[PDB]
């Protein structure tokens, strides 16, 4: 379609491809919504290829893509007003990634990123995350926002709120954490879990539609891996390390005490301990103004 | 422990809340000391109050005084 309708061939052909740029993005999102567990390999050969073509289209019709992108942001918000997580699908998760591919995440203000990032903070908080599918959806949501702030490295309070409830959700309370609001007390992991077998921490998108202990453990491990990069990259430079990490340090201590074999939290606690040691928590001084003449 | 009890814009004029209502209102062009006292007594605003202490309804009444003087029988010489 692009080759048969290059701008050179005829007048008004830029518009047709420009509209096609909007059309292609919806198709890329549309295919992800469709079931593809049967031919995941074939879906992978098409789904990435369409994104590559969209990248070529975006380079010359970024304006047309951007208008479609914002409309989709409006569309999910309206659907979320009535359906909550039921509106949310795999296609939404895919669309958010494509924006990161095709738009500058590392901007203070951006036309498509900022409405998207706000929408992601809303889901990281508003959504109950009371089901394994819902927690898996939130785990993917944290990864997207993390790569949005990969260089800008800004602080997202909802990212803090997401980890605390998910961390406490899988340990259900211990009676020591009454400041954290849980939405499901029946997702507590059993004690018999091993935590020494090598379980894949990658969460496939198609599995979310199908979505026991192994799946719960895999979702847990992926979020923990997201936690450490957040502690290592974003929170470390932030002033309020000791305050932000203090509830999380207590959560991780419970994981070690209950599961001695589970090695991930101990690596975090040892690593978290190292950072607080080096960092100087000096009282701030911010009104020191240059004298006026 | 719990007990619950500087500048204003009137007639397109900045008036200091510090100054007494009558002589803070005098700053507005066309308003004299006698005119300001007349407006205050018509508005039922206590003259001992500072311009800051005035409430919103009192200021609304005062702007009604100055914008509609004849409707409230302000003497002609004042206008």
């Amino acid at each position: 379609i692009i080759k048969a309708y290059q701008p050179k061939l005829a007048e008004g052909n830029k518009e047709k491809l420009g509209k096609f740029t909007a059309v292609l993005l919806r198709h890329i999102i549309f295919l992800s919504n469709q079931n593809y567990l049967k031919n995941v390999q074939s879906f992978k050969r098409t789904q990435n290829a369409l994104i590559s073509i969209l990248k070529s289209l975006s380079e010359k019709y970024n304006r047309e893509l951007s208008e479609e992108c914002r409309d989709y942001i409006n569309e999910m918000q309206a659907r979320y007003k009535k359906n909550h997580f039921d509106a949310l699908s795999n296609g939404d998760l895919v669309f958010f990634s494509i924006i990161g591919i095709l738009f500058s995440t590392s901007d203070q203000y951006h036309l498509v990123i900022t409405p998207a990032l706000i929408l992601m903070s809303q889901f990281l908080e508003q959504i109950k995350f009371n089901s394994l599918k819902r927690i898996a959806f939130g785990a993917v949501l944290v990864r997207i926002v993390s790569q949005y702030q990969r260089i800008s490295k800004r602080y997202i309070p909802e990212v803090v709120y997401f980890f605390q409830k998910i961390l406490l959700t899988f340990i259900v309370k211990p009676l020591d954490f009454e400041n954290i609001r849980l939405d499901s007390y029946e997702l507590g992991l059993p004690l018999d879990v091993d935590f020494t077998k090598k379980r894949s921490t990658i969460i496939p998108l198609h599995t979310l539609s199908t979505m026991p202990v192994d799946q719960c453990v895999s979702v847990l491990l992926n979020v923990m891996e997201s936690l450490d990069a957040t502690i290592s990259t974003v929170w470390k430079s932030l002033p309020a390390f000791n305050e932000i990490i203090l509830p999380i340090q207590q959560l991780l201590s419970a994981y070690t005490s209950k599961y001695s074999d589970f090695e991930k939290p101990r690596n975090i606690l040892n690593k978290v301990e190292k950072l607080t040691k080096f960092t100087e928590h000096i009282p701030l001084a911010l009104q020191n103004h240059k004298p006026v003449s | 422990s719990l007990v619950v009890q500087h500048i204003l814009r009137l007639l397109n004029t900045n008036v200091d809340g510090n100054i007494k209502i009558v002589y803070a209102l005098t700053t507005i062009k066309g308003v004299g000391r006698r005119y300001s006292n007349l407006v205050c007594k018509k508005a039922d605003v206590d003259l001992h109050k500072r311009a800051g202490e005035l409430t919103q309804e009192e200021l609304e009444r005062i702007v009604q005084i100055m914008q509609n003087p004849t409707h409230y029988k302000i003497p002609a010489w004042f206008l």
């Binding site: 990161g100 309070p157 701030l284 | -």
Partner: protein, 267 residues
Amino acid sequence: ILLILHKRIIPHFHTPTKLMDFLTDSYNLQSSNKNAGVVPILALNGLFELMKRFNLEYPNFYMKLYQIINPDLMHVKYRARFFRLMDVFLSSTHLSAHLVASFIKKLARLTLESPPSAIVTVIPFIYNLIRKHPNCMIMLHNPAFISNPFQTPDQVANLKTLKENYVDPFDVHESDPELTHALDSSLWELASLMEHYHPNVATLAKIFAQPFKKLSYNMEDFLDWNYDSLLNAESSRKLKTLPTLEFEAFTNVFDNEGNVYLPGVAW
């Protein structure tokens, strides 16, 4: 019932003082049901109307108010109602600097895990309290830790030892706001908010780094903000110029089961 009590019920009763026991019990309600934890917030509005109309008292009012502040308060839809009453409560002239310092410190601590809508409420609220009570300005900045070019070498060494021995004295578990030692603490959290992802929220937090020229901030312009309103606010803006793109290229959008945008997720 508690939502409409202050407006649609109490004004129509001859002797609304008969609602004291019902409101007092609601304000003191402590239940294992989490959904009942918001009852005291709503009862506070109706309670204060009775307090105001007939010169009635609630024992240990501020200690109870300090306890009610909790992370749940930042998330409930009725935050706007609570903060409207709290300003009237903390506008009193007989409040200790330590009392207000504990309120400021606790709110700032909660802001680390609060939505941007709540952050928009807390920042002007803390600005007003500090402006009302300049003694709390020491929390925003401690001059003893500033380094002066002219300070003698012995002063430099003494400053270093002071930087070696400090400990944050704010206690989060103390229920008396006059004993939390918040005044000796520092608002090291509000500095984090200046790096908030949203540009407008970060700009508001930047006010604390700026001179306090403004006398006060109108809370009614910051109270009732929601996620929907903020999204609707940005969508209104028109595309004057094309958005900037990314020069870097990624082979695969998600990870497998060369360059991956989102490691750890697969199709």
